Structure formats: C-alpha cells, structure tokens
Amino acid sequence: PQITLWKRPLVTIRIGGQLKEALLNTGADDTVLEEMNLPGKWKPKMIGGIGGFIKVRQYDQIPVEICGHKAIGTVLVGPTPANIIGRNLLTQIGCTLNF
Amino acid sequence: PQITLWKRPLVTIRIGGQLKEALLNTGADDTVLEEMNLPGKWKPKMIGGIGGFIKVRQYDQIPVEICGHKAIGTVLVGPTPANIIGRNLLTQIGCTLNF
C-alpha cells in the first residue's frame, strides 16, 4: 500500500500469536515493542533514543506479520513509549520512502 | 526519488543558510535539529521518545529545503543526537511510505 504521513503511520502486526498496533519508523534501526512476554531466550541490551538510553530484552529470529506481510527477525522488548517497527524489519517487507 | 532502507535514510537539507544531513523519520511528529544559533523569537518546549524528554526551542515558519524540495514549518532546536526531519515537513514534500 501507499501510506501518506498526515497521521502517524500505524499498522497492525501479529507477534507471538497476538495482535498489536505499531508505528512504521524509518528513524529506528531496530524494532522495539513495549513490555510483553515472548517465547525463547533473550539477552539484555541497551538502545538509545531522543532522550537517552534504556535497557531492553533482545529476542532473535521472531516471526512478525506486518499488514499481512511476513518477516522474521530481531525484536527488542522494553519500556518504549510506543511500539515501533524499525528498518531491520521494514527492509524485509520491501518498504521504501518516496517523494 | 525512492529511498531504500538498508541504511539510515539521510539526506541533505538547507536551513538558515546552512546545509546539513538529516534523517527522514516517519517516527517523528516534529522536525528536530541539533543546536544551532538561528535568529528570531522562539518558545520553550519538551519533546520525548525512547529514553525520556529533552528541552528544545521552537521556531515557527522556517524555510527548509529538502533534497531540492521546498517546505516551510516549525523547527525545534535542542540537544538531539541527530538532525531529524519529521512528518510536519515530510507531508509538505509529498513523501510516502510504500510496500
């Protein structure tokens, strides 16, 4: 689809068998979701944002469906103010910026 | 043009008689630039994201050229770790997300 930016680019994704809402974020290297349980082992990691750094749990090789498109990759879980789909998964679904 | 997301989507912008590299960020409502001494009146503001909030100065109706595309709007200036072009200006240049 083609998404304009007059509003936040939110979409529905399915992860761990559950549905959630997330923002397509070209300004994020990674995909970060708010606290939630996910199967598998996780390693502690730190990421930076506009206001500083936070600690997150890193889960690898996780299947994520974004608007019907399949992706399998790294998902970070932690105290982010919003669920964001970063470039690591945006590239998998073939997303590009156009103008 | 069409910008792929294998790498951070950085582009050159012209603001206040200067050329700078800025990140096209669909995950940002506003445009935030690294500290720079711009003339004109401004208003104090707090913006947030991952990690917390930072204090910035808000300037209105500032002309900004992005990759040859002219735009004009609000620009926030403060201690951001990167120059960020948000949706307020992305809509003005007809930028869309496509997949």
Binding site: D29 | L23, I47, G49
Partner: peptide
C-alpha cells in the same frame, strides 16, 4: 507528549 521515536543501537 512522546512524539519522536528516533532509535539506534550503541
């Protein structure tokens, strides 16, 4: 309010 979700790894 939270409105700028820039993000990056160390």
């Amino acid at each position: 309010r939270p409105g700028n979700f820039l993000q990056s790894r160390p």
